[PDB]
Design a protein around this ligand. Structure first.
Ligand code: SF4
Ligand SMILES: [Zn+2]
Ligand SMILES: [Zn+2]
Lengths: 149, 98, 714
């Protein structure tokens, strides 16, 4: 809400801050009053960049930094992989080595081509999906429920 | 300063003395009195204040630095005693000359 | 003057000691013999220091193995200078008695800003500026480049010290801060680092609390070398507040913006470093894989591995994520929110920042920032503050709390919100001192009743004794005035604050008291706003002008420059016969820093019980947490916070040399039994029921008579 305004239209944000940023594959500031502007024509196209969007690629966010928007969303997707708990590995280095590779994957996806990352992730899928992904995915709800209370 | 002006030309042999019967603790002066203390010490003018209902600090330093004595009135009977004590000639110190 | 103490024979420089000194020495020896931490109170500002120091020295001679060294801490450097003066006098006395020098060393540590010999850092006075400049000059990079001897300003003093002082330590002696500067200049060494090294072999070391409490800098010099040492804190009744300040970290919007800009500079510098020198600086990654100072204490601090942040880019992205989360969490406009564990959980959930990688954030910041060869740490200091907060929150929140204030006090609408991380209990941060050191003596003056202190600070005291000053003359004649000339309650209650009659009673009392009291008087209010309101009301009425006629009037302001100028003029007014009436605030830094002696602050006036505003939410966490844990009533702690503060601000007039003076408290609340009971023993025992609730006029008359009695000689 502290932003001066949209790259297009800043009258709305200057005055009342109810508008919230909308995340997109463009990692690219947008505002609801301008989301209507995008829906009417193009229907999922960035005004200046023109990046195509499947169905509006819109989700509410409140982080003024577009790089943070993309980084956080990519990290959200990555967390679904390599979610195995630390204690699964007795080796001291292996505790955070795999997290190092996870962070490298996130940074790689943010800017560099994601083809290699996708191929690698397919390799990790074929092995992890059998046991680790299912187990940690199920245990996430249990741990979250216990933690909340 | 008035007392100093009159006593400056007095003969050296005689003992110049001042007894300030101080009543109001305040002292509003055009110039700082610590400087005047230096001139008093040079002029060997003994100043022995008698304060009233107050232990004034500037007069404490005045009395002790200049060689005089400082006192505060415990009551009227003690006031008589203080002034009668100051009646007698004071002993001549090293600075005093005959 | 050799005193045949029960434990042993103890030398003493001055001719005579009052009975309270005998009681003090015997109780202190009892604590030392038990080798257990304890607390005791002594009235006199001066004299207790010499008794304590002499007893510690004699005990060291008797049982050198029992005590390795003495660590005597004082509130402020100007104050600790007087302590080193006392110690020097004692050492000269003992040396004359023995006839020869003995292997005894005593020194005082202080900031590089306060003492240093480098002309470049001399003109600058900011502590952060001095720290950054000295770090640049002494940087491992600057040292290695000095080995190359390239054309570049290199600070020769540290290099020469490394060459010489490392080989030879100073034999013995006592060095004040000012004298140690001269020694450093003469020997071409650091007055700072030389003392730092002498800490390894020094019998007595003196420095303020922030050199011994904050884990960032305290630990490095308070390492385990002093496993069994006599650590003593002097006049440390406000120890809980300072111990809390050592942990509390304040995050503001302006600071956060500066952090973002500094992070941008960090990224640009990383890019330049990559293009210029990459392999040599990349070796840091290897040492990191193997595995500004950390705020984590000895046991809490961890060094297993840095975590998922193993490279400069990864760490910078981590800081970007955490900074964004803090930025938004602060931008939220809402009522004050408290969330010690929930903040960490929400951070991890919202932005995917695990607490374990967050734990090593500040440590990895220090290492990575060192790699960058930055010009100085002063520019990036806000980022380091945020990093310390980041590591602390992930470190622990059991006895902590994050408070968010979108709106600041005293402003209906302000665009500078502040996030506080105020602690709630000081035992957490002071635990290492008590545990590491065999015994700690919290010697204090004007101490509110000792029973609370063990509750606030988790320790088992050995002795609990209150020492009452005893003199052939009644130096102090305190009184409390609750009834005015109108026989009206004069309590300075929040609802009664606006009362014009009460304000008038205060004004009239001050007028008469200034009329009779000799030169030099200090009046302490409860707050700046309350002081201003009372001053304005007196100004509207003719009371203030009459006070101006009777005696000069000076007032305190938040700004330190004006405070200093006003106090400087006040001292001259006290020297002269004009006199002065110094209005100040009890919480004012001037009240704690300043010390009143003979013909200074002769009559201490306390206008209203000192109570903090009941709206500051920080105190709510601090207070309700104490109610929940350690079982202290909110009213009990609040009244203790008032009585301790008032005793601090009223106990100055009895500094030393038996200088008369009267302490008048213009509030009927002090007449209440609870306030009197929590008052220090030495003042209370002098206080009597006859003068407990004197009217304004009656108090003025008794003050005049008491001043008459004290005027005459012994
Ligand atoms: S190395 Fe020593 S002389 Fe040089 S700036 Fe630092 S403290 Fe001062
Ligand atoms: Zn727009
Ligand atoms: Zn775009």
């Amino acid at each position: 809400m502290d932003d001066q305004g949209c790259p297009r239209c800043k009258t709305t944000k200057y005055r009342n801050p109810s508008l919230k940023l909308m995340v997109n594959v463009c990692g690219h500031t947008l505002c609801e009053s301008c989301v209507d502007l995008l829906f009417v024509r193009g229907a999922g196209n960035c005004p200046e960049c023109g990046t195509p969007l499947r169905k509006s690629n819109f989700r509410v966010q409140l982080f003024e930094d577009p790089t943070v928007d993309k980084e956080v969303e990519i990290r959200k997707k990555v967390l679904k992989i390599y979610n195995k708990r630390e204690e699964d590995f007795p080796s001291l280095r292996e505790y955070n080595d795999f997290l190092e590779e996870v962070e490298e994957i996130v940074f790689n996806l943010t800017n560099n081509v994601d083809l290699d990352n996708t191929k690698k992730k397919m390799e990790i899928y074929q092995k992890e999906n059998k046991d680790v992904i299912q187990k940690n995915k199920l245990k996430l709800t249990r741990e979250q429920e216990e933690l909340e209370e | 300063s008035i007392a100093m002006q009159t006593l400056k030309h007095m003969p050296g042999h005689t003992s110049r003395e001042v007894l300030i019967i101080f009543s109001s603790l305040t002292t509003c002066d055009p110039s700082n009195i610590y400087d005047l203390i230096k001139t008093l010490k040079a002029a060997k003018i003994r100043v022995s204040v008698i304060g009233l209902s107050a232990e004034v600090r500037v007069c404490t330093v005045l009395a002790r630095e200049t060689g005089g004595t400082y006192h505060v009135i415990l009551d009227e009977s003690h006031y008589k005693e203080l002034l009668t004590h100051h009646v007698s000639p004071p002993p001549a110190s090293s600075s005093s000359e005959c | 003057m050799k005193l045949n103490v029960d434990g042993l024979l103890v030398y003493f420089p001055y001719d005579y000691i009052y009975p309270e000194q005998f009681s003090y020495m015997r109780e202190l020896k009892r604590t030392l013999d038990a080798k257990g931490h304890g607390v005791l109170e002594m009235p006199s500002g001066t004299g207790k220091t010499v008794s304590l120091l002499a007893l510690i020295m004699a005990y060291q001679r008797a049982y050198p193995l029992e005590v390795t060294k003495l660590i005597y801490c004082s509130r402020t450097v100007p104050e600790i200078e007087k302590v080193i003066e006392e110690l020097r006098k004692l050492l000269n006395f003992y040396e004359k008695q023995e006839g020869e020098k003995l292997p005894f060393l005593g020194l005082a540590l202080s900031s590089r800003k306060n003492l240093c010999i480098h002309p470049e850092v001399t003109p600058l006075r900011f502590g952060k500026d001095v720290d950054g400049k000295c770090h640049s000059l002494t940087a491992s990079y600057v040292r290695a480049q000095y080995q190359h001897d390239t054309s570049l300003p290199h600070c020769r003093f540290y290099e020469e010290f490394d060459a010489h002082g490392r080989e030879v330590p100073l034999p013995a002696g006592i060095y004040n801060l000012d004298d140690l500067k001269a020694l450093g200049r003469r020997q071409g060494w650091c007055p700072y680092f030389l003392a730092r090294y002498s800490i390894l072999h020094a019998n007595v070391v003196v420095y303020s609390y922030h050199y011994l409490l904050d884990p960032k800098i305290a630990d490095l010099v308070s390492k385990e070398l002093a496993r069994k040492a006599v650590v003593v804190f002097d006049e440390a009744h406000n120890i809980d507040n300072v111990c809390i300040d050592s942990m509390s970290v304040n995050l503001t919007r302006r600071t956060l913006d500066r952090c973002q800009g500094n992070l941008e500079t960090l990224q640009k510098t990383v890019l330049r470093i990559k293009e210029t020198d990459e392999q040599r600086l990349r070796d840091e990654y290897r040492r990191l894989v193997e595995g500004a100072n950390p705020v984590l204490p000895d046991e809490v601090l961890q060094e297993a591995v840095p975590g998922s942040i193993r490279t400069a880019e990864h760490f910078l992205g981590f800081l970007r994520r955490l900074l964004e989360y803090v930025k938004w969490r602060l931008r939220v406009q809402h009522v004050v929110q408290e969330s010690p564990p929930a903040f960490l959980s929400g951070l991890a959930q919202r932005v995917c920042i695990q607490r374990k990688p967050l734990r090593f954030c500040a440590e990895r910041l220090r290492s990575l920032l060192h790699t960058l060869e930055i010009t100085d740490l002063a520019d990036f200091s806000p980022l380091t503050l945020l990093a310390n907060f980041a590591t602390l929150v992930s470190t622990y929140a059991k006895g902590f709390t994050i408070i968010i204030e979108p709106f600041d006090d005293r402003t209906p609408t302000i665009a500078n919100p502040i996030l506080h991380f105020s602690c709630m209990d000081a035992s957490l941060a002071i635990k290492p001192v008590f545990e590491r050191f065999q015994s700690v003596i919290i010697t204090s003056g004007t101490l509110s009743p000792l029973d609370i202190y063990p509750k606030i600070l988790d320790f088992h005291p050995v002795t609990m004794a209150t020492f009452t000053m005893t003199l052939a003359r009644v130096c102090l004649c305190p009184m409390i005035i609750g009834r005015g000339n109108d026989q009206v309650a004069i309590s300075s209650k929040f609802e009664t604050r606006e009362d014009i009659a009460v304000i008038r009673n205060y004004g009239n009392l001050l007028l008469e008291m200034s009329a009779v009291v000799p030169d030099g008087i200090v009046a302490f209010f409860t707050s700046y706003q309350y002081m201003e309101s009372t001053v304005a009301s007196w100004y509207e009425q003719g009371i203030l002008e009459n006070i101006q006629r009777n005696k000069l009037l000076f007032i305190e302001t938040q700004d330190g420059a004006e405070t200093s100028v006003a106090l400087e003029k006040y001292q001259e007014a006290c020297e002269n016969g004009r006199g002065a009436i110094l209005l100040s605030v009890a919480r004012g830094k001037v009240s704690e820093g300043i010390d009143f002696v003979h013909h200074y602050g002769r009559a201490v006036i306390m206008f209203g019980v000192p109570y903090v505003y009941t709206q500051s939410r920080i105190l709510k966490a601090r207070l309700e947490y104490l109610r929940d844990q350690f079982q202290i009533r909110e009213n009990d702690f609040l009244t203790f916070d008032a009585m301790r503060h008032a005793a601090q601000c009223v106990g100055r007039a009895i500094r030393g040399k038996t200088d008369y003076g009267l302490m008048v408290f213009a509030d009927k609340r002090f007449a209440r039994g609870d306030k009197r009971g929590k008052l220090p023993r030495w003042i209370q025992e002098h206080l009597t029921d006859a003068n407990l609730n004197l009217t304004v006029d009656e108090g003025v008359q008794v003050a005049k008579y008491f001043l008459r009695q004290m005027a005459q000689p012994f």
